[PDB]
Amino acid sequence: RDWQLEKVVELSRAGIRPPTAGNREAIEAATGRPWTEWTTHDGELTGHGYAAVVNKGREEGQHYRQLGLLQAGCPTAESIYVRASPLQRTRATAQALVDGAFPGCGVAIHYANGDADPLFQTDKFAATQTDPARQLAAVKEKAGDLAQRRQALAPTIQLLKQAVCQADKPCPIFDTPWRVEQSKSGKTTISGLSVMANMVETLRLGWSENLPLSQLAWGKIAQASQITALLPLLTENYDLSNDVLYTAQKRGSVLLNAMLDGVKPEASPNVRWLLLVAHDTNIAMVRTLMNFSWQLPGYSRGNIPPGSSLVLERWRDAKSGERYLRVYFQAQGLDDLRRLQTPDAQHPMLRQEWRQPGCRQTDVGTLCPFQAAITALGQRIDRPSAPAVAMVLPK
């Protein structure tokens, strides 16, 4: 064996959800019409979502056993530690991953006893909140000419409008020019764009969910390519929120730091696989701190599909004993999620590997000298916003 996988650190997004309660209200207001009520409650992991996540977890359990990272059979405390954001959907997604990865092993997952995890709900902690003033300057600065940004996305805005608006009946959201706004809590948002993004996320999830076409966008969206054509609005909103460097630094540093320290030797806990299950906003902030941009086929730049994940693998050369870090983002394509396609040779997981000068191509993927990789991924971390977190939760 030329290469030995030593440690996995993984940050999964929650699986397929219906829109959140807030999303629903914004998007129904924005389109002057009610949207499909799913058989899943708003914000929770759909069963289809669980199915899709189980399928990824099953392949991943098989993959990592074959690579000798994981023991055969049921895992121990040394095999894996799963830590999920306390929301229902992330817990359920955590359960679904280990459900697939360790068939019948009743593997426990862990989450904070309250509603805030310092790794995830980072805006609930002193060290890891944005300063409103700074946040506004930073968003306004990346945004620049917002009228110019709206014009550039005009075609995509139109496709969204053709999909979600009734002819003859008003569609207010498409009429409001794009401004940076800031709520009393200091959350910034782009008027019009944000809610359009929310709409687009809901359509994508509806597609992925295997909703009937009649309940997705009233018959208007019939093929995966139509979802793909709408995703640049979602990319736009991410560019002006979660992937604004400053926001990523204040709210995402603690997570990236916990992730890099987790892939480091002598890590605590002593586990072969540290699986963190949280939200798209969290993945977005981390990859932005990693300065890791991806574009998977069928998706737009930076897109974070349901049940997707950012992975850090520490590998070891069998000859030299030198250590390498492999970093990638993985997801399933739109139709694959819709079809509950089990990933395999003819329908592989979509994947893009991070790279920098120094990395090398190997049988097991792009591998980057460890210390140079850890240093590079970490440059952008704000140390004061990266407190140490005990990775093993209580209870």
- Method of determination is X-ray
| Residue 68 to residues 1, 75, 98, Cα–Cα distance (Å) | 10, 13, 17
Helix axes 132-143, 245-263, angle to 10 degrees: 100
Which tokens in the block code for residue 385? 């916003």
Let me know: does 192 contact 160? Beta carbons within 8 Å: no
Query: What secondary structure, in 3-state letters, does the chain show?
Result: CCEEEEEEEEEEECCCCCCCHHHHHHHHHHHCCCCCCCCCCCCCCCHHHHHHHHHHHHHHHHHHHHCCCCCCCCCCCCCEEEEECCCHHHHHHHHHHHHHHCCCCCCCCECCCCCCCCCCCHHHCCCCCCCHHHHHHHHHHHHCCHHHHHHHCHHHHHHHHHHHCCCCCCCHHHHCCCCEEECCCCCEEECCHHHHHHHHHHHHHHHHCCCCHHHHCCCCCCCHHHHHHHHHHHHHHHHCCCCCHHHHHHHHHHHHHHHHHHHCCCCCCCCCEEEEEECHHHHHHHHHHCCCCCCCCCCCCCCCCCCCEEEEEEEEECCCCCEEEEEEEEECCHHHHHCCCCCECCECCEEEECCCCCCEEECCEEEEEHHHHHHHHHCCCCHHHCCCCCCCCCC
* Residue appearing with tokens 């990775």: 391
State the pairing for strand pair 80-84/273-278: parallel
Query: What angle (nearest 5°) sits at the alpha carbon of residue 374, between those of residues 368 and 379?
Result: 125
Residues 323 and 296: their CA atoms lie apart, in Å, by: 28
User: By residue range, what is the domain housing residue 128?
Assistant: 1-395
Residues 309 and 361: their CA atoms lie apart, in Å, by: 22
Give which of 83, 87, 111, 86 is closest to 97, Cα–Cα.
Answer: 83
CATH number of the domain residue 37 falls in:
3.40.50.1240
Residues 365 and 327: their CA atoms lie apart, in Å, by: 9
Residues 325 and 359: their CA atoms lie apart, in Å, by: 9
Which tokens in the block code for residue 324? 């390498």
Residues 254 and 128: their CA atoms lie apart, in Å, by: 7
Give which of 30, 20, 21, 82 is closest to 53, Cα–Cα.
Answer: 82
41 labeled part of a ligand binding site: no
Residues 375 and 151: their CA atoms lie apart, in Å, by: 39
- In sequence order, which residues have a C-beta less than 8 Å from that of residue 132 and are 6 or more positions away? 182, 186
The Cα diameter of the chain in Å comes to 70
- In sequence order, which residues have a C-beta less than 8 Å from that of residue 157 and are 6 or more positions away? 150, 174, 196, 233
Beta bridge partners of 8: 273, 313
Residues 144 and 157: their CA atoms lie apart, in Å, by: 19
Instruction: Give the number of domains in the chain.
Output: 1
